[PDB]
Design a protein around this ligand. Sequence first.
Ligand SMILES: *[C@@H]1O[C@H](CO)[C@@H](O[C@@H]2O[C@H](CO)[C@@H](O)[C@H](O)[C@H]2NC(C)=O)[C@H](O)[C@H]1NC(C)=O
Ligand SMILES: *[C@@H]1O[C@H](CO)[C@@H](O[C@@H]2O[C@H](CO)[C@@H](O)[C@H](O)[C@H]2NC(C)=O)[C@H](O)[C@H]1NC(C)=O
Ligand SMILES: *[C@@H]1O[C@H](CO)[C@@H](O[C@@H]2O[C@H](CO)[C@@H](O)[C@H](O)[C@H]2NC(C)=O)[C@H](O)[C@H]1NC(C)=O
Ligand SMILES: *[C@@H]1O[C@H](CO)[C@@H](O[C@@H]2O[C@H](CO)[C@@H](O)[C@H](O)[C@H]2NC(C)=O)[C@H](O)[C@H]1NC(C)=O
Ligand SMILES: *[C@@H]1O[C@H](CO)[C@@H](O)[C@H](O)[C@H]1NC(C)=O
Ligand SMILES: *[C@@H]1O[C@H](CO)[C@@H](O)[C@H](O)[C@H]1NC(C)=O
Ligand SMILES: *[C@@H]1O[C@H](CO)[C@@H](O)[C@H](O)[C@H]1NC(C)=O
Ligand SMILES: *[C@@H]1O[C@H](CO)[C@@H](O)[C@H](O)[C@H]1NC(C)=O
Ligand SMILES: *[C@@H]1O[C@H](CO)[C@@H](O)[C@H](O)[C@H]1NC(C)=O
Ligand SMILES: *[C@@H]1O[C@H](CO)[C@@H](O)[C@H](O)[C@H]1NC(C)=O
Ligand SMILES: *[C@@H]1O[C@H](CO)[C@@H](O)[C@H](O)[C@H]1NC(C)=O
Ligand SMILES: *[C@@H]1O[C@H](CO)[C@@H](O)[C@H](O)[C@H]1NC(C)=O
Ligand SMILES: *[C@@H]1O[C@H](CO)[C@@H](O)[C@H](O)[C@H]1NC(C)=O
Ligand SMILES: *[C@@H]1O[C@H](CO)[C@@H](O)[C@H](O)[C@H]1NC(C)=O
Ligand SMILES: *[C@@H]1O[C@H](CO)[C@@H](O)[C@H](O)[C@H]1NC(C)=O
Ligand SMILES: *[C@@H]1O[C@H](CO)[C@@H](O)[C@H](O)[C@H]1NC(C)=O
Ligand SMILES: *[C@@H]1O[C@H](CO)[C@@H](O)[C@H](O)[C@H]1NC(C)=O
Lengths: 380, 273, 378, 184, 49
Amino acid sequence: ETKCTLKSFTVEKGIYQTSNFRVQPTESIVRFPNITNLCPFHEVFNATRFASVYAWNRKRISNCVADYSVLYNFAPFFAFKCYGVSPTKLNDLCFTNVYADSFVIRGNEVSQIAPGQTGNIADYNYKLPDDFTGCVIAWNSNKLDSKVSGNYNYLYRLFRKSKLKPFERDISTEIYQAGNKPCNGVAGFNCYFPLQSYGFRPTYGVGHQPYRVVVLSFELLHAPATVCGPKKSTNLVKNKCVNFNFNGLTGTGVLTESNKKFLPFQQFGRDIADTTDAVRDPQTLEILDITPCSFGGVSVITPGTNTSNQVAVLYQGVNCTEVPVAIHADQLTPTWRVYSTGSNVFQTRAGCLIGAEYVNNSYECDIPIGAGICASYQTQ
Amino acid sequence: TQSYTNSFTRGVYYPDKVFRSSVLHSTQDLFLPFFSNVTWFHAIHVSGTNGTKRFDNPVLPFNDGVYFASTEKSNIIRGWIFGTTLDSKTQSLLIVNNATNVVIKVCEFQFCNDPFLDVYYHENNKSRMESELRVYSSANNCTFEYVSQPFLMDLEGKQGNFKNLREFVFKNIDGYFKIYSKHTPVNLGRDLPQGFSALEPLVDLPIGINITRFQTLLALHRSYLTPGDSSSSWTAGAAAYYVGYLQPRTFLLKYNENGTITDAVDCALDPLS
Amino acid sequence: SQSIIAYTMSLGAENSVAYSNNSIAIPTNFTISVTTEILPVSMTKTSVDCTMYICGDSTECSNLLLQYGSFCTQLKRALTGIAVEQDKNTQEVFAQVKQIYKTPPIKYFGGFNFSQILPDPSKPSKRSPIEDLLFNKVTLADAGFIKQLICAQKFNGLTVLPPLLTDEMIAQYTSALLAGTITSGWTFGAGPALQIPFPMQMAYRFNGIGVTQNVLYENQKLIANQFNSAIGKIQDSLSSTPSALGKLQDVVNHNAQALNTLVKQLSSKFGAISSVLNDILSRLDPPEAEVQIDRLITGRLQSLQTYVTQQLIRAAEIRASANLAATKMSECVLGQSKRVDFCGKGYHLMSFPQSAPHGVVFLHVTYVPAQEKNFTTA
Amino acid sequence: DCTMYICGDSTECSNLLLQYGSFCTQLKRALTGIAVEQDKNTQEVFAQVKQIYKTPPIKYFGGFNFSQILPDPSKPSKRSPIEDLLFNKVTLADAGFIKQLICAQKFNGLTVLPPLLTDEMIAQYTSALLAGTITSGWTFGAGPALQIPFPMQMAYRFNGIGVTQNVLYENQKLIANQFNSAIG
Amino acid sequence: LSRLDPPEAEVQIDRLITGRLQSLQTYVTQQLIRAAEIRASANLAATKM
Ligand SMILES: *[C@@H]1O[C@H](CO)[C@@H](O[C@@H]2O[C@H](CO)[C@@H](O)[C@H](O)[C@H]2NC(C)=O)[C@H](O)[C@H]1NC(C)=O
Ligand SMILES: *[C@@H]1O[C@H](CO)[C@@H](O[C@@H]2O[C@H](CO)[C@@H](O)[C@H](O)[C@H]2NC(C)=O)[C@H](O)[C@H]1NC(C)=O
Ligand SMILES: *[C@@H]1O[C@H](CO)[C@@H](O[C@@H]2O[C@H](CO)[C@@H](O)[C@H](O)[C@H]2NC(C)=O)[C@H](O)[C@H]1NC(C)=O
Ligand SMILES: *[C@@H]1O[C@H](CO)[C@@H](O[C@@H]2O[C@H](CO)[C@@H](O)[C@H](O)[C@H]2NC(C)=O)[C@H](O)[C@H]1NC(C)=O
Ligand SMILES: *[C@@H]1O[C@H](CO)[C@@H](O)[C@H](O)[C@H]1NC(C)=O
Ligand SMILES: *[C@@H]1O[C@H](CO)[C@@H](O)[C@H](O)[C@H]1NC(C)=O
Ligand SMILES: *[C@@H]1O[C@H](CO)[C@@H](O)[C@H](O)[C@H]1NC(C)=O
Ligand SMILES: *[C@@H]1O[C@H](CO)[C@@H](O)[C@H](O)[C@H]1NC(C)=O
Ligand SMILES: *[C@@H]1O[C@H](CO)[C@@H](O)[C@H](O)[C@H]1NC(C)=O
Ligand SMILES: *[C@@H]1O[C@H](CO)[C@@H](O)[C@H](O)[C@H]1NC(C)=O
Ligand SMILES: *[C@@H]1O[C@H](CO)[C@@H](O)[C@H](O)[C@H]1NC(C)=O
Ligand SMILES: *[C@@H]1O[C@H](CO)[C@@H](O)[C@H](O)[C@H]1NC(C)=O
Ligand SMILES: *[C@@H]1O[C@H](CO)[C@@H](O)[C@H](O)[C@H]1NC(C)=O
Ligand SMILES: *[C@@H]1O[C@H](CO)[C@@H](O)[C@H](O)[C@H]1NC(C)=O
Ligand SMILES: *[C@@H]1O[C@H](CO)[C@@H](O)[C@H](O)[C@H]1NC(C)=O
Ligand SMILES: *[C@@H]1O[C@H](CO)[C@@H](O)[C@H](O)[C@H]1NC(C)=O
Ligand SMILES: *[C@@H]1O[C@H](CO)[C@@H](O)[C@H](O)[C@H]1NC(C)=O
């Protein structure tokens, strides 16, 4: 390894740093909430009376096991573009709350449902936030919503004083005060009705045919879980380097019982790194602790390679009643787990040294180690 | 009556729901600025055994949330209504408490102002006031409903000295009304005492409505201690009902060792701050 | 009755001289004074790991970082060189003598009293009272003693190596030099140490500055009393002052502040959806995950490079300070310096070294004139 | 200042720059440290004296001519002719005098702070050292200033290199003439 | 900002900000070295005085 870290077949006398060591996880655990009911997704997509844009129906979902893999054969899915949450990586997450909004619009305006877009529909009828996360699903609906005479069932607002805030409903049957005359319900000259039609006929081509859209808004944020995917939980192990899946929180380390005071409205613990420190058990409600596994650097002490081929390793800042003395396969990143580790063992303030015997003598030292400790080649 | 007072250092709540300890984390959020005015408000309806109409409960604008502070005997302050024009023209809310219930909802009530004043409302003799709701009279185009635990769980110290100060904060940022609340019975007579306390979130739910107006619901059927005067423009007068507005600010909170909050610094008050 | 007042700075007290044609001024008395001087010698060593810091235990991030080439082999050689320079800095200042000298058993130096600087065997650390006070007055942050709360929050590839020379054998060096300079004069700085009585050595030191030895040989008692009083009161001056060891404290604090900032920079989006790798891998899919991970990687590289960029300049400044300290130790301690305003203020006599956390402290002894009278000269 | 040099008075740009974390706290701390070091540099060089000495009223130093280095009372700035020539020779660009065309076009967060020691007490320090070194010899840098006639100090400085004082005491006129010619 | 919608205006402004940050770091990077050299010269001048 020393011959490999610097490109040469001869290494001179001294101490060199080669790589790092860290114990490996042994088993993996997953703990998700235990919900059995299946919340309904059929009727939200499958309904015949979706409301208009000026007043769109909202469906809120609660505790369930949402299987986001069966809805694909519910519609042609003309547009299935999703935001930050990956559409395929959606069956393995946990969300706080999920919402669905349902409405039908003109197809030409379908592209106008997006953050940072204005126009006609996006300024007076419906608005989306700039940092929205979720999905949208739009597909053609000219087969059903088509009248030979005229489809006067869907309306939209043309005239409003100011743009609305995102996610806001503004249903109102008022009269717009266009011009100077304060008209009081005449609805005649210079005072037009705020609502118009969506006359949909098969004669019109693409873009003018009605398009049916449904938007799903997620709540991926640090909060107690309500909706989770279909996964099977397992048992808890402690005092061992393991990998956890705490309610969508993936990581590794050692879990031990803690003495924190997590209030009923507190779910996660934090230090100054934006990394989690303490977690609450999803289905037992016990306060745990997280500690990263042991790790450190490796230094190789070797004399001249033309004098001998014996080396002594030094683990920095690791006190070796721990894994250096109890070494096993699939537990150390250096594959070379082939030292005795029961003989030639010394403890040093700069990490314990393996491969050297202490001698009470004192000379000028050749290879410095640290803390007033040096190493050298010596006869019997 | 109406009067002005100094808010001192009150109205700070846990911004996020994560744990911390011995940290001086700072945040930017809606807050009540230090050392502002809090404007008192009092509704006056009691006189002998005769009507004595009040015309109380005026309109109050609801901008950027509202901070609430009052000392009700048991449940004298009951509900709050939110909306616009309180008529069948634009939707409005309905928030009101019960013994152990809450029936907040979104609707389009034409009107519900039926105080039903009692000819013998004088509390010193009798305080007979039962089932005096007289609300949700009409509903035009309404489907939203919600029932759950009421916001307040009052406690009694067996005497009026430990008057509860029900500090509430209301906000409507993208829905999910925050009802940060805390019970601090340790008041002993002085308004807004020197000290420090925090607030915790309880409920969250999104609806969607502009809410450019705020009003309260009082026990007009049984009310007491309502003196009257022409106090206005930075004067004094017994109200026992405070209202404060909130603005976006930047705060520096010193989290306690245990995990609570001990001190806070406003970053836009003094150049020293 | 308290306020803030703004004024114009005054340079100093106004004074005038009475220069003429045939007037001279001669002092009739002297005064011995003892000053102090503090010099940093080294800073804390450190080592940073790219793999643990940039891409925490994630294979894909490490594979993506591998494509960049040798931007981390370069970031290890500089740190190793800094560590080697820091280790070498402390050797030049202290390791000047070849042997180690013992103080004589009986402590009588002709009235001079040296208990405040000689080692105290009663204490376990065998450090002088002034050395103990200097050690206690400076609060160390980290020393790398198998720590296994802020320091415990550095499981991000950041470690602090311990110095090769512990602060137990540095005191041995200080005692060796001090015993050599109080038992042999300056003769042990060139060749073999030669014994000489202390009064004769002090008489020769006075003769160096142009004052004949009879002054000492007739005012020995007064000179010893003044020396004892100055040595006694310098400790009180060091103890009662608000903050005298400011340079060492600044050196200690700068590295800690830089490390804290480097740790905190991990909590940055750098124009990404999130600042945690596990979520950004689980939520996303590999195509856009590569772009987001590249953003995070380039942000972390940019934040990491500045650390070593500033560390190099700080190491250069510390090396310059250490070279100055070594020169001062060679010249004021191992001999008498004729350089003006170099080894204390006034005519130089001798000096004593002391060890401080990450630095050295010099105790100069200086000669200053006293009340003077005029005379008429030709 | 980053918040104006980088994102000129734009709220969107400021909010988008806030995502980079603490990146301009260092760029301010380093510059403040540089300014503090610059202020400290000019104090060690000049502030070597404790008291501001004054030149004697009459000026007779045994034939030597110090009019070219000593301060000139006639000039309003009390600067020596050599100092005036040095000041006129160098054309300084900006010094922080409330500037309020290239300098006026650098209103992008780039400001030039003025030095703490204005260039009127530096001349006072220089005059103080000159008076103390020509009226008291070298003894005012070690303790209290002791007066001494200038020719005696001349003989002292000649004796310090290996030449006895009789050389000066017999060649005083020639030495003074040579010094005057050189300083002229 | 005027000729474009927020979505890709974001990435363009990121480009501009990162360019300006890179252009600004080098200024202080060189200023530190210049200050160190000036400090060394000032120390030499102080010793010479
Ligand atoms: C030189 O100065 C010293 C300063 O200490 C003088 O010593 C003092 O002398 C007076 C008068 O004899 C005593 O009362 C003091 O107690 C002495 N000081 C101490 C610390 O003991 C000394 O006398 C001076 N020499 C001359 C010749 O005047
Ligand atoms: C001078 O040396 C002597 C001993 O050689 C010191 O004398 C004692 O020192 C201890 C240490 O603090 C004191 O507690 C005693 O009161 C001292 N006794 C006497 C008779 O002086 C003395 O402290 C030394 N001088 C100084 C200034 O410390
Ligand atoms: C002895 O020297 C002192 C100063 O060291 C002289 O005191 C000053 O002399 C100047 C010369 O005229 C006067 O202008 C000052 O007013 C004097 N100072 C004070 C406080 O009066 C003193 O005159 C000298 N004595 C002799 C005889 O030369
Ligand atoms: C030497 O000192 C004398 C005064 O003692 C100076 O004399 C005059 O100085 C002014 C200053 O510009 C000249 O304009 C006069 O011409 C000088 N007159 C004489 C007779 O010298 C003299 O200038 C000084 N020497 C130098 C080189 O400046
Ligand atoms: C999950 O299992 C625990 C058993 O400890 C039970 O108490 C809890 O009620 C279960 N969750 C639900 C939602 O019923
Ligand atoms: C909904 O499903 C039913 C059968 O389950 C089907 O008859 C109907 O056509 C579907 N409607 C839509 C809009 O998909
Ligand atoms: C917002 O306030 C205006 C004030 O005139 C009101 O007309 C409007 O109805 C409010 N918005 C909603 C959605 O009610
Ligand atoms: C090592 O020693 C051998 C002789 O045994 C010599 O030939 C060789 O050059 C040496 N190599 C080094 C690197 O010193
Ligand atoms: C390190 O190991 C030694 C061996 O017994 C022990 O004395 C010491 O307490 C240990 N320290 C830690 C931090 O484990
Ligand atoms: C070395 O010294 C220790 C005591 O310090 C003693 O116990 C030991 O036997 C000696 N010899 C060794 C370690 O070979
Ligand atoms: C409150 O308002 C009044 C005027 O309405 C003013 O005199 C007073 O200074 C205000 N108080 C504060 C703290 O702003
Ligand atoms: C108030 O009204 C009642 C109802 O008629 C009446 O009996 C009473 O006299 C009135 N009060 C006064 C003061 O007249
Ligand atoms: C409110 O409380 C009263 C008394 O407990 C009860 O009769 C009434 O039903 C409650 N209201 C609702 C809506 O349940
Ligand atoms: C008080 O009210 C009661 C009704 O409960 C009534 O009988 C009585 O006459 C009233 N007045 C007095 C003075 O008690
Ligand atoms: C609202 O209710 C009224 C009943 O007066 C009815 O005429 C109207 O059509 C309803 N509107 C909606 C959108 O249900
Ligand atoms: C904080 O915790 C300590 C021990 O963990 C306890 O003694 C103290 O009472 C706590 N402080 C409170 C509860 O305010
Ligand atoms: C010194 O001697 C010169 C010689 O003429 C004379 O002009 C001058 O006045 C003398 N100095 C004093 C202070 O009298």
